[PDB]
Amino acid sequence: IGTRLQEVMARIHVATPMDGTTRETFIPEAVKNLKKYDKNDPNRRVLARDIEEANGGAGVFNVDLRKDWILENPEWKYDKIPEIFDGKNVYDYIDPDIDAKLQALEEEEERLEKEGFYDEDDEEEEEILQKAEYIREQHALIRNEAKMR
């Protein structure tokens, strides 16, 4: 059998699993109830091409990306979602379990405040430090005199 003929044999060959089993399919039930779209049908479904043609054509019509959002409250569909706050990313801090962690943080904060973690604390020491600073100044003046001479 020539190479071209084996190629068309491999094209017409249909491979099947040896066990004869089949996978479960997941076609939704609305597909059977769908009516096929026809251009000549006067009651056809209005499409995005139709809306774009009615609102300026291609390159003029501005599509609304938030129109098909699924939210808990549909009033939120056109909000300005925050992104930056005081040099920090809001999306870095977005967490569904935020209130429990924050309340645990508040418990920890009051625990360390009760334990004394943020608490804040001699004249002879100040005197000896002032004397040492005076001595260092005199040393610097002596070095400057040596550098001059």
What part of residues 130-149 is at the interface with other proteins (CB under 8 A)? none
> Do 123 and 130 form a contact (C-beta atoms < 8 A)?
no
* Stretch of 2-10, 122-130, 131-139, 140-148 contacting other proteins, by CB under 8 A: 2-10
Pick from 57, 35, 53: nearest CA to 44: 35
The DSSP letter of residue 72 is S
CB–CB of 83/89 below 8 Å?
Answer: yes
Asked if residue 1 binds other proteins (CB under 8 A), the reply is: no
Nearer to other proteins, 49 or 131 (CB): 49
Of 25-33, 130-138, 141-149, the window that binds other proteins (rule: CB under 8 A) is 25-33
- Interaction between residue 114 and other proteins (CB under 8 A): no
Residue 128 in the binding site for other proteins (CB under 8 A): no
What part of residues 62-101 is at the interface with other proteins (CB under 8 A)? 62-63, 65-66, 68-73, 76, 79-96, 98-99, 101
Give the nearest distance from C-beta 130 to other proteins in angstroms.
16
Residues 45 and 37: beta-carbon distance below 8 Å: yes
Is 124 near other proteins (CB under 8 A)?
Answer: no
Residue reference for tokens 């071209």: 4
User: Are 38 and 44 spatial neighbours (Cβ–Cβ below 8 Å)?
Assistant: yes
Q: Are the C-beta atoms of 51 and 61 separated by less than 8 Å?
A: yes
